[PDB]
Amino acid sequence: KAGNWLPGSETPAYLENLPASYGFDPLGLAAEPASLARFRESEVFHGRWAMLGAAGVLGVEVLGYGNWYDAPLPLVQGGQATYFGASVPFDLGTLAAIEFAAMAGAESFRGAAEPEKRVYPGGAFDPMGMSKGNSKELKTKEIKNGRLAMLACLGFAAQHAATGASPLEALASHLANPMAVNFATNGVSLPL
Amino acid sequence: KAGNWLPGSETPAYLENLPASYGFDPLGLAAEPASLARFRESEVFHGRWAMLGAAGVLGVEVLGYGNWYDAPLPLVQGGQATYFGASVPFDLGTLAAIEFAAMAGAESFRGAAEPEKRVYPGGAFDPMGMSKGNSKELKTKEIKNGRLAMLACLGFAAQHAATGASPLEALASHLANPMAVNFATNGVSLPL
Amino acid sequence: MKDFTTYLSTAPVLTLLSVTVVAGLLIEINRFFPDALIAAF
Amino acid sequence: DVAGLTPCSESKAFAKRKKNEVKALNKRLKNYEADSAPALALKATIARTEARFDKYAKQGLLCGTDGLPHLIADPGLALRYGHAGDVFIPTIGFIYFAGWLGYAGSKYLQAVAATAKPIEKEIIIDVPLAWKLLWEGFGWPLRAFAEYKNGSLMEDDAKITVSPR
Amino acid sequence: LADVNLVVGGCTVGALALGRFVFLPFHRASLAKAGMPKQNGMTHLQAGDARAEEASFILKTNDPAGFTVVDVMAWGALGHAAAFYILATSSLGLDRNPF
Amino acid sequence: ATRPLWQPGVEAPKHLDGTMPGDFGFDPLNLGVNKEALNWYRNAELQNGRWAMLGVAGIVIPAELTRVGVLNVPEWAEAGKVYAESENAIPFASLLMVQLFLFNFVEIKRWEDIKKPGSQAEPGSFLGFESGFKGTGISGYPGGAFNPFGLGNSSKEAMDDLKWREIRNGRLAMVAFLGFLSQHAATGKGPLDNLADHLADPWGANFCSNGVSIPSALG
Ligand code: CLA
Ligand SMILES: CC1=C[C@H](O)CC(C)(C)[C@H]1/C=C/C(C)=C/C=C/C(C)=C/C=C/C=C(C)/C=C/C=C(C)/C=C/C1=C(C)C[C@H](O)CC1(C)C
Ligand SMILES: CC1=C[C@H](O)CC(C)(C)[C@H]1/C=C/C(C)=C/C=C/C(C)=C/C=C/C=C(C)/C=C/C=C(C)/C=C/C1=C(C)C[C@H](O)CC1(C)C
Ligand SMILES: CC1=C[C@H](O)CC(C)(C)[C@H]1/C=C/C(C)=C/C=C/C(C)=C/C=C/C=C(C)/C=C/C=C(C)/C=C/C1=C(C)C[C@H](O)CC1(C)C
Ligand SMILES: NCC(=O)NCC(=O)O
């Protein structure tokens, strides 16, 4: 296990050998084997997408190209989307088309495989061969970093929907005045 | 079967071995064998025709040649309808006559064939030799796409009869502000 | 008494009594709430 | 307005009818000392007539070419025009009370059928039982729909006697 | 409203060809299913209506597909009716369009 | 069986045994003689009670919190129009259709529960979530994903006790909501307004003084 979520407790029996398992299942969602066998792959994929998303949200702002929210504004407004500074002359419809074609073929190729190959495909997805050499610890690494990134992406969306600022802008506004610039101070999150 | 449209329910027994069956028959319209055979043929043929129809309705508009409703108007009140931007030198009378002759020949040849060869006649209608490698699965895909396309064509008709727009225009209008321009906002669908 | 109440339960008397009660009730309702053409609530 | 019928509160013929009927009663008044029993009766009648004509105008009933209130008997074309109290609401009210009486009688029949002398318990009613069932009949929509969904409301025709074709 | 000759001739020839080549299998199948009319289980000929005796000039033909003269006349009648629908409708010049 | 009844001295009907939670032998109209109808009525009472508890909470708690000086939300009757006049307000028809479209899915799921109380737990129904719909052997008490804290999920008789508490509170809430509706129809004031009004003059300000309860024609 390594973890107990609630320090004292009794944890679900089916959660024991999984990578980065803390017995977190008070709802009994993965009790049957098939539900858990699907939810593991769903969580890993969710974590990878989150890690990449959080990387993008930090990178689009830390380097100096704007928010993670204003990203799609130059898509309408007449036209013209910016990527590092290029024009990428591609209207809205062709973006949806090209991305739909790419994600359809990719997601229809990665899923049509066996359950283990659906989440942990060695093949060319381990070019540096770190898939071997005791991959349980590395799987724990991946899953925990993915959980952190999921919460990070959720926080990005929520703090934008509350204060309207930006990750780095919100961080700066908090660090300047930790005292009256919290979630408790904007009259959205904490109401009382 | 694979599916049950009302998960916790019991399905009719005559709907099991059929491809793309979900037990969906609340009116018992297939309670008789010969009736169900005719219905199966008619469903597949309707699916094919509606796939062609939906593809045409979308491809005349995404390619940019007017919408499906105003395509036959120029033939009346003038003449020489346009295809790909060209102009056929045919009137409504000769169009109706040529279509009647050709469709009569085609559907008279189809209708005189064997029961199964009236709906799945591979022969020269499968040049790419795809009916092999267990067509059952392929039949299910064809039926489900046909069901989707049939519902889409009926949707084209009803949406144009209610709002008077065009498929992509209605799509864009709903996407712009869904919570206030769905079907519940026009004065037709909802008698309020 | 028991036979008198049995007589009061006979169809000729109980029917007439119930018609009298319902008639009186409609007459009272129309006396207090007259000229009501619609169910105005 | 629902079909060329202006609200009685607007129709001039409706007010004219009010006027004429009141004027007739005034002419009947002008013969008695306004403190005698006939005079009090006439004054009460006039007050009742005025109250009725004001009540009808308040509720927005529709008057025709003549000054007489009209009613609407189509749900939807009366619900989107504020005239559901004309036929639809009294429809519900009747259907309810009629069903109440019918269900009370039906259950009384089914209760006294399973007794010693069922032909006797129809001419000499059991008043406590009749009254109990009359009280239970108020929930008749619920109980009747329960018996229909149960199949115990009706009887299969294989058990009902029929004529020789 | 453009040449009675062309429209009526083309329509009639097309209808003849359509009833000889295209609709003939279904026509013959339906005719074989239906059959001669029967009263009380016997044809009108067996019952004694010797005028209901089948016309002799249709039982055997010389068309390799069995296209009799009466078939020709029925299909030509349909063709002429359709052709004159075409003519009479194109001859009018009024807005019937519900738009 | 020997439990307290709605009327002490009047015996309970021989169909309202003593097993259902909230059973006080109250059934003067004999609506629940049929067993299947009794199950459907039990389930209906649960739904009405739960929705009435939610509604009466969302009526009094905002009202009392407004009274003391917080949140200053309108009174429940006009709260529909107060939102409806807002700028970016969803139109009523579209809003009602959104609500009805969501509740269609949810309530047909609960319905298929009510028929066979294990209906929605068949594998392949949802996307792995179908296990949380297994039910608890009685309709109206799903458990699983519902009841996250596992309250009463221990001693059986503990669950029986909480069931009586729930049903009593729900019955109180429905009676109170009927009270709110009838009070606002009569006196165009709020619930706490009526409460603070009655305590002022209990013999003068009541239901026999608003003039809408007792018909003015009679008096
Ligand atoms: C409670 C008794 C009862 C019940 C449940 C019914 C029910 C029914 N009757 Mg019926 N009927 C009854 C008594 C009853 N009737 C009596 C006493 C007579 C003799 C006058 C008739 C003569 C009669 C005829 C001629 C017809 C029906 C028909 C019908 C059916 C159509 C509904 C209708 O509108 O009928 C109409 C109702 C009446 C014409 C008169 C109703 C009599 C009173 C109002 C009810 C009696 C209540 C009872 C005396 C009180 C007992 C209460 C208890 C506490 C003691 C329906 C199933 C029609 C049918 O054929 O079905 C389609 C039909 O044509 N009935
Ligand atoms: C476990 C459990 C179990 C038990 O039994 C019960 C309970 C307790 C309930 C539970 C819980 C759970 C949870 C918590 C969940 C959550 C999740 C999440 C948050 C996800 C995220 C998720 C998220 C994610 C992926 C993310 C996404 C995003 C992304 C990618 C990004 C995008 C982008 C970018 C790049 C940039 C640009 O410029 C913008 C955009 C375009 C926008
Ligand atoms: C199954 C069942 C059974 C149970 O038991 C009961 C119930 C429930 C009743 C059921 C259901 C039903 C349903 C849903 C139905 C529907 C159908 C449809 C939608 C059809 C359509 C169908 C449809 C279709 C085919 C369509 C087709 C189309 C087309 C050709 C088109 C053409 C065109 C185009 C291209 C375009 C142009 O510009 C014009 C035109 C020329 C016009
Ligand atoms: C038991 C029995 C049996 C025997 O045998 C017979 C008899 C006697 C008949 C009986 C009795 C009965 C009764 C008493 C009943 C009653 C009921 C009720 C009241 C219900 C309610 C019920 C109620 C309910 C659900 C309610 C609900 C509510 C709600 C949602 C609310 C909502 C809302 C809110 C929040 C606020 C806003 O601003 C407005 C609104 C929107 C409005
Ligand atoms: N047989 C396909 C399958 O197992 N799919 C699982 C998923 O939805 O990821």
Short mmCIF file of C-alpha atoms in Angstrom, two decimals, chain C residues 1-38:
data_model
loop_
_atom_site.label_atom_id
_atom_site.label_comp_id
_atom_site.label_asym_id
_atom_site.label_seq_id
_atom_site.Cartn_x
_atom_site.Cartn_y
_atom_site.Cartn_z
CA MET C 1 -85.32 0.56 18.20
CA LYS C 2 -83.25 -1.85 16.31
CA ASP C 3 -86.15 -2.48 13.97
CA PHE C 4 -86.88 1.25 13.74
CA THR C 5 -83.28 1.90 12.67
CA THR C 6 -83.56 -1.01 10.25
CA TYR C 7 -86.60 0.75 8.81
CA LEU C 8 -84.59 3.96 8.54
CA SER C 9 -81.99 2.01 6.54
CA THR C 10 -84.52 0.86 3.96
CA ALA C 11 -84.05 2.05 0.37
CA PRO C 12 -87.32 4.12 0.34
CA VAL C 13 -86.34 6.12 3.41
CA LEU C 14 -82.58 6.28 3.10
CA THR C 15 -82.73 7.30 -0.57
CA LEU C 16 -85.23 10.02 0.18
CA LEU C 17 -83.14 11.17 3.16
CA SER C 18 -79.94 11.31 1.10
CA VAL C 19 -81.65 13.17 -1.73
CA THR C 20 -82.99 15.61 0.86
CA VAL C 21 -79.52 16.07 2.36
CA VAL C 22 -77.83 16.61 -1.00
CA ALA C 23 -80.61 18.93 -2.17
CA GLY C 24 -80.34 20.94 1.04
CA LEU C 25 -76.57 21.13 0.60
CA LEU C 26 -76.82 22.39 -2.98
CA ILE C 27 -79.48 24.87 -1.89
CA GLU C 28 -77.21 26.14 0.89
CA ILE C 29 -74.20 26.42 -1.41
CA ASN C 30 -76.25 28.37 -3.93
CA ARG C 31 -77.63 30.55 -1.15
CA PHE C 32 -74.19 31.58 0.09
CA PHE C 33 -72.23 31.38 -3.19
CA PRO C 34 -74.79 32.32 -5.84
CA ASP C 35 -74.60 32.88 -9.57
CA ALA C 36 -71.27 31.06 -9.96
CA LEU C 37 -70.81 30.39 -13.67
CA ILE C 38 -67.14 29.34 -13.64
#
